Amino acid sequence: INGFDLPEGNVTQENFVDMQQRCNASDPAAYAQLVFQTCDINAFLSEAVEGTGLAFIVFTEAITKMPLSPLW
Amino acid sequence: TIEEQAKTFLDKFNHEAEDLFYQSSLASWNYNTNITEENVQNMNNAGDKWSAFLKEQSTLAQMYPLQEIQNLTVKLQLQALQQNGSSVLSEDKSKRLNTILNTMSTIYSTGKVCNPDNPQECLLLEPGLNEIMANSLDYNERLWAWESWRSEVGKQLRPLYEEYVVLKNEMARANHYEDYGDYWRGDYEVNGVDGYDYSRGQLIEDVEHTFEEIKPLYEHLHAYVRAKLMNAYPSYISPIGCLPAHLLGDMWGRFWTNLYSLTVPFGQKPNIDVTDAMVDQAWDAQRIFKEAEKFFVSVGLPNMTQGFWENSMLTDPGNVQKAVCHPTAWDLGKGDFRILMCTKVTMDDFLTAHHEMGHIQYDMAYAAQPFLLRNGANEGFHEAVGEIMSLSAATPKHLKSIGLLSPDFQEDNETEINFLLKQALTIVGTLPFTYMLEKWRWMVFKGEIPKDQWMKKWWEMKREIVGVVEPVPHDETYCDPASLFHVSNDYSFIRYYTRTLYQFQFQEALCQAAKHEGPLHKCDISNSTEAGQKLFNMLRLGKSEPWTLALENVVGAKNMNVRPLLNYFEPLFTWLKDQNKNSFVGWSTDWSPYADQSIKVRISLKSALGDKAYEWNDNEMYLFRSSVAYAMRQYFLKVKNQMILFGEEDVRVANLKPRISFNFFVTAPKNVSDIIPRTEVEKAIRMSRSRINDAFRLNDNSLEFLGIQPTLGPPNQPP
Amino acid sequence: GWSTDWSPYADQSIKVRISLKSALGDKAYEWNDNEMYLFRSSVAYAMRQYFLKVKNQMILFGEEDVRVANLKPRISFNFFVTAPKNVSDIIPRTEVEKAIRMSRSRINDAFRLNDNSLEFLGIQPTLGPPNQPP
Amino acid sequence: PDNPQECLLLEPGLNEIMANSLDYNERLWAWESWRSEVGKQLRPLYEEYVVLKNEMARANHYEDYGD
Ligand SMILES: *[C@@H]1O[C@H](CO)[C@@H](O[C@@H]2O[C@H](CO)[C@@H](O)[C@H](O)[C@H]2NC(C)=O)[C@H](O)[C@H]1NC(C)=O
Ligand SMILES: *[C@@H]1O[C@H](CO)[C@@H](O[C@@H]2O[C@H](CO)[C@@H](O)[C@H](O)[C@H]2NC(C)=O)[C@H](O)[C@H]1NC(C)=O
Ligand SMILES: *[C@@H]1O[C@H](CO)[C@@H](O[C@@H]2O[C@H](CO)[C@@H](O)[C@H](O)[C@H]2NC(C)=O)[C@H](O)[C@H]1NC(C)=O
Ligand SMILES: *[C@@H]1O[C@H](CO)[C@@H](O[C@@H]2O[C@H](CO)[C@@H](O)[C@H](O)[C@H]2NC(C)=O)[C@H](O)[C@H]1NC(C)=O
Ligand SMILES: *[C@@H]1O[C@H](CO)[C@@H](O[C@@H]2O[C@H](CO)[C@@H](O)[C@H](O)[C@H]2NC(C)=O)[C@H](O)[C@H]1NC(C)=O
Ligand SMILES: *[C@@H]1O[C@H](CO)[C@@H](O[C@@H]2O[C@H](CO)[C@@H](O)[C@H](O)[C@H]2NC(C)=O)[C@H](O)[C@H]1NC(C)=O
């Protein structure tokens, strides 16, 4: 959206790939400048750690993104 | 048949039109050579008799068949008279269109601007603004004149232009044409000759093709001019960018002719100037015309009519009698031929005398044709003949042959290069301008450009085709193209392209038929009756046969060509390619004069508010400009201890996108040349960002300034 | 005789009362002519929005069409609105009341004010929905 | 405002409207417009004028310029 000043809410988790292709077609040079990150849930799922890391690095951070955070 | 009855009426109509036309021309002649309210009505009533006669005779021609007519001789005359014209419009609509045209002409003629500091003295375009746009070397004065004329006159002329295009399109559609652009291009249309046909659409393509052969030489001229202008205005022009539009020697950039003092290849030595030599010879109007007549008759063309020599207006009356000194040619008819122009003692007077004599000789060479057939092949031949005559009459060997310019004088190439570049700055610097303006008008009439993207497309085409960038961003409140004479006053502009190509085609053909050996630009025509005969062949044709045929009668080619023009400047082209060996030949359509002090803004309404988020219209842009003006006012009051009245008109916005993103900069209240540096605008936004944010219900992440990041977040909860 | 309170424009004026110390208490900004400029721009925005979204007309009101009188240290004053290029055209109060009602959430947020702090005498706030136990 | 090309000066045009016009709108336009243009131009010059004239009168054994 920033790279091609597209209207916010037009690109979505579903039409992202097609919009990406259209934008590259419209301006390959500008698109070439754009840098994207690989989005794979398996990657974050594989981030599962054993030992204190699972609680102090994985459970403590999931709790901060939860309402009534301190209680939990 | 019918064809018989058609020619019957046409022959009668020819007699009925010729006599009354002569009376009208005689009356107009008298008034133009006698500014007396009394004769003003005299020519008027005659012109009125000429106009009513017109309408009635067309009504008479209506019943006469068109396609049924086979004899193209008569068919052409009928088609010329068959034009229903604007009358196709409703009465109320006709009155509305007439008042719109009058209003636009009056706004252009009587509009005026004046200084922000002394608003008592106001300058009109004709004298004050034009002089600034030609003589001044000051960036601030030129920017003020350019922007102020655009603001006042274009903002007045925009809605009239919208109504004008709607009404003219309606009339053209009701008159069995596609659009108004089609009506204008219908002048070139030729049909029913089976081999010399020329469709109205085809012309567009041809024009485009021709421009493909100009881009190269012109880009080199542009690059050369850019380097010179960079010296005339250091720290204002990017060597890889377009030329600012207010530095091109006049108001619009139609001609670069006023850059010569600053773009002279060899300023060391001046060009040929015999005005003094003419004064030493004490040559007078009669002489200039007589020596001119010698050159014109020197090639077997008829001698100038004695009538002209008896009833002409060569010298300024200056005897309680006042006449417009503008050079012209009157073809009253039945052997009555005249030329009216004030005669000084100058080279330009000599060349204008040759130009007008070429005009009148062309006009009188085909007096045998009917009254409706007594015109040029199209809108480019008439001026092309005069242009080639003047060009042939200005050769240095011609000056050597008329008694001055003593033979013990050698002409070097440096002065020749100077002359070639002076010619280039007028001839080649206008072709992109003409092409782009006619392209924009054609696409505006065609409906290709919506009514909310006229200025966007205007400036996009101007950056892309001409390589000229606006110094201040213009929104759709403006009508910059309507600020020209030809646009507001409803005049066609493609004549200046075809005329420029036809003149050079004719010059090359005739000067080749004159058995030259040297370069084209140094060649002459005199003593070449063969060249004169070829020209005369098309001259006498008038509009009796197709223009494509008439052009072939001289150049041997049915269509227009850029090659002859490119050859006329091969010398300068080589020199320019050498001079631009280091210089970046070309331009980039992203650099703007104001782009180095702009701030970009990105707004995310759907994130901060999610649901129940307001729509973003021009009223939100008004509020945003007011907020930025408030911010700048507060910064200047609370830090610099100065009270400055910034407004929403000082906040200039460009490049608006659906992302709700755009650029802006700020100027001083009554000074478009004063731009507040970004650093001060960043400091002002830093000071007032909380108020600017809470005015829009956004909080420092849905309203970002791309250069300004928040830093004050210090927490002290757990001590 | 004559009375020195009647004005030709006093019928179509709206009074405004602003309480900065009540709303913000500490760290409350000072009120200068730049805040008056912002207030005139906000009222012009409000009138523009009302005329665009209801009457289907586009009118270019500015801060020069919002005429202000009787400025007091109470932060009180009277204002009226005129047509852009016509000083003889005065927008009747009813239209100005409707415009302020439409854009009051925005005008208040532009001044960190809350309807109680920013009072348009003659225009009463009527948006208070109460509900806790369904 | 409808036509910016025809501009009136005080003596020839504005005075005639003020002397004869019975139109409320025309008279209000003439009155306000003359006030806006000419008075907004004439204010700061009047401030500097009063300061200088007061200084000159004070330096001439007079209290103020009114004196
Ligand atoms: C179309 O009509 C014109 C006018 O009648 C014809 O021109 C005539 O041509 C003949 C032959 O050259 C001359 O004798 C006449 O004097 C011409 N008349 C005029 C008024 O000029 C023309 O020839 C016709 N064309 C065709 C194809 O029939
Ligand atoms: C201009 O007016 C003339 C005269 O009314 C129109 O001529 C008519 O044209 C149509 C279409 O060819 C014919 O059916 C009629 O018989 C013509 N009338 C006459 C009197 O000859 C002409 O069409 C009008 N032009 C336009 C485009 O409106
Ligand atoms: C065209 O030819 C004529 C005739 O030769 C040239 O006229 C002569 O010009 C030379 C150079 O000026 C004079 O010395 C002769 O005395 C002229 N004599 C005659 C008979 O005219 C004329 O100059 C030629 N055209 C040009 C432009 O050079
Ligand atoms: C006219 O011709 C002369 C001779 O060719 C040109 O002089 C040359 O200029 C270039 C550039 O400075 C030098 O590299 C050459 O060595 C020069 N040649 C000689 C023989 O001196 C001159 O530049 C030309 N003038 C124009 C207007 O192009
Ligand atoms: C408008 O602003 C510009 C830019 O500040 C002024 O141009 C400057 O004018 C001063 C005084 O003549 C010069 O010393 C500067 O060198 C100029 N620089 C630039 C960037 O133009 C311009 O004079 C101002 N115009 C008015 C009427 O005040
Ligand atoms: C400016 O506004 C005034 C006030 O509305 C207009 O004056 C009225 O105009 C209408 C329409 O011509 C008349 O019917 C009224 O009798 C006028 N009197 C009033 C109400 O003052 C004025 O015409 C407007 N003119 C411009 C330039 O917009």
Q: Is B486 a catalytic residue?
A: yes
Instruction: Collect contacts of D26-30 with beta carbons under 8 A, ≥24 apart.
Output: D28/C87, D28/C88, D29/C87, D29/C88
Regarding beta strands C86-90 and C76-83, do their DSSP bridges make them parallel or antiparallel, or are they unpaired?
antiparallel
Written as six digits, the tokens of B110 are: 């009587």
Binding site membership of B699 for ligand 3 (Cβ less than 6 Å): no
> Helix crossing, B495-513 with B200-212: angle to 10°?
70
* Residues in chain C, overall count: 134
Rg (CA), chain D: 18
Residue B361 and residue B108: Cα distance in Å, rounded?
Answer: 35
Binding site membership of D24 for ligand 6 (Cβ less than 6 Å): yes
DSSP letter assigned to residue B190 = B
Touching partners of C (3+ C-beta pairs < 8 Å): B, D
Binding site membership of B176 for ligand 2 (Cβ less than 6 Å): yes
Question: Of residues B152, B356, B387, B470, which has the active-site annotation?
Answer: B356
Residue B550 and residue B558: Cα distance in Å, rounded?
Answer: 8
- Cβ <8 Å between D4 and B110: no
- Chain B residues near residue C45 by CB distance under 8 angstroms: 619, 622-623, 626
Answer left, alpha or beta for residue B655, where phi above 0 means left and psi between -120 and 50 means alpha: left
- Chain B residues near residue D5 by CB distance under 8 angstroms: 106-107, 110-112
Written as six digits, the tokens of B59 are: 């009504």
Written as six digits, the tokens of B636 are: 């200047």
To the nearest whole Å, the CA of B432 is away from the closest chain A CA by 27
Residue B202 and residue B560: Cα distance in Å, rounded?
Answer: 12
Touching partners of D (3+ C-beta pairs < 8 Å): B, C
DSSP letter assigned to residue B62 = H
Phi and psi, residue B435, nearest 5°: -60, -50
Q: How far is the CA of B247 from the centre of ligand 2 (A)?
A: 52
- Cα torsion through A18, A22, A28, A34, rounded to 10: -50
Residue B648 and residue B652: Cα distance in Å, rounded?
Answer: 8
Residue with the two structure tokens 């030992």: A51
* Residues in chain D, overall count: 67
Regarding beta strands B243-244 and B468-469, do their DSSP bridges make them parallel or antiparallel, or are they unpaired?
parallel
- Cβ <8 Å between B112 and D41: no
3-state helix, strand, coil in chain B (%, to 5): 55, 5, 35
Q: How far is CA D18 from CA B266, C87, D11, D12, in A?
A: 64, 16, 11, 11
Taking alpha carbons only, the member of C13, C115, C92, C97 closest to residue C50 is C97
Q: How far is the CA of C85 from the centre of ligand 6 (A)?
A: 12
| Ligand 1 atom closest to the CA of B368, numbered from 1 | 21
Locate the chain D residue with the closest alpha carbon to B112. D5
Under 8 Å between Cβ of B635 and B687: yes
Residue B433 and residue B70: Cα distance in Å, rounded?
Answer: 41
Under 8 Å between Cβ of B134 and B250: yes
The DSSP string of B541-594 is HTTSS-HHHHHHHHHS-SS--SHHHHHHTHHHHHHHHHHTSSS--S-BSS--TT
Residue D41 touches chain B, beta carbons under 8 Å: yes
- Chain B residues near residue C110 by CB distance under 8 angstroms: 627, 691, 694-695
Which residue out of D2, D3, D5, D45 would a mutagenesis test of the B interface target, given it has the greatest number of B Cβ atoms within 10 Å?
D5
Contact call for A and C: 3+ CB–CB distances under 8 Å: no
Regarding beta strands C76-83 and C66-72, do their DSSP bridges make them parallel or antiparallel, or are they unpaired?
antiparallel
Residue B72 and residue B10: Cα distance in Å, rounded?
Answer: 13
Residue C7 and residue D15: Cα distance in Å, rounded?
Answer: 25
DSSP letter assigned to residue B481 = G
Taking alpha carbons only, the member of B530, B532, B268, B521 closest to residue B396 is B521
Rg (CA), chain A: 19
Query: Element (H or E) spanning C84, and its range?
Result: none
Residue B663 and residue B597: Cα distance in Å, rounded?
Answer: 10
3-state secondary structure of B81: helix
- How many C-beta neighbours within 10 Å does residue B585 have? 15
Q: Is B18 a catalytic residue?
A: no
* B363 class by beta-carbon count within 10 Å (0-12 exposed, 13-18 middle, 19+ buried): buried
- Chain D residues near residue C9 by CB distance under 8 angstroms: none
Phi and psi, residue B477, nearest 5°: -65, -15
Residue B152 and residue B251: Cα distance in Å, rounded?
Answer: 14
Q: How far is the CA of B168 from the centre of ligand 6 (A)?
A: 32
Resolution of the coordinates, Å: 2.8
Residue B363 and residue B540: Cα distance in Å, rounded?
Answer: 9
Strands (E), B428-549: 468-469
3-state secondary structure of B222: helix
β partners of residue B662: B601
Residue C102 and residue C44: Cα distance in Å, rounded?
Answer: 13
Written as six digits, the tokens of B1 are: 């048949």
Under 8 Å between Cβ of C93 and C12: yes
Residues 6+ apart with CB under 8 A from B266: B414, B415, B417, B418
| Ligand 5 atom closest to the CA of B117, numbered from 1 | 27
Residues 6+ apart with CB under 8 A from B610: none
Question: Of residues B18, B170, B189, B486, which has the active-site annotation?
Answer: B486
B93 alpha-carbon distance from chain centroid: 29
User: Which residue of D4, D37, D41 is in closest CB contact with B156?
Assistant: D4
Binding site membership of B7 for ligand 1 (Cβ less than 6 Å): yes
